[PDB]
Symmetry: none
Subunit: 96 residues, 2 copies
């Protein structure tokens, strides 16, 4: 699947994370690492908005670049995982 800034949060779920548990430790730990790293970086990308010493311009720029790096990392983990036959869950709007 294609990770974007819009759909990140709806794909990087504990469910999709739990699917990684079938890979051998050799392949599983680095993928779990990229996944949890992207998620930590994504969920922190807006924190400069609340930092009073940062301008709105810089906080918006940083937010944008942190998200794009987290998206890149999640794409890397998903792509590594799909080559091993893992199929992640899409977001089905009518289920929420």
């Amino acid at each position: 699947m294609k990770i974007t800034s819009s759909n990140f949060a709806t794909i990087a779920t504990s469910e999709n994370f739990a699917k990684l548990s079938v890979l051998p430790k050799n392949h599983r730990e680095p993928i779990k690492g990229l996944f949890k790293s992207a998620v930590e970086q994504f969920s922190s990308a807006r924190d400069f908005f609340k930092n009073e010493n940062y301008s709105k311009e810089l906080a918006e720029k940083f937010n944008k670049e942190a998200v794009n790096e987290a998206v890149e990392k999640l794409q890397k983990a998903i792509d590594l995982a799909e080559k091993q036959g893992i199929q992640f869950l899409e977001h089905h709007h009518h289920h929420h």
Copy 2:
């Protein structure tokens, strides 16, 4: 009510998790966390039988203790919730 292995599925639902967004935040956050943590753990406990590197004795032992723990979580979640006036279905 009081949570057990058989009743966990019937109680921890989206409907019941829906009733919790109405809560005031200081109460709303930890009870949503406990609830969500319980569900995720109840489910992960089933992947123990998928691990071919686990003896069936070990996989069953871990399955119970994980379930048991998820039951503790959902119980207090429900304790902490009903104390704020949320009726759940039996």
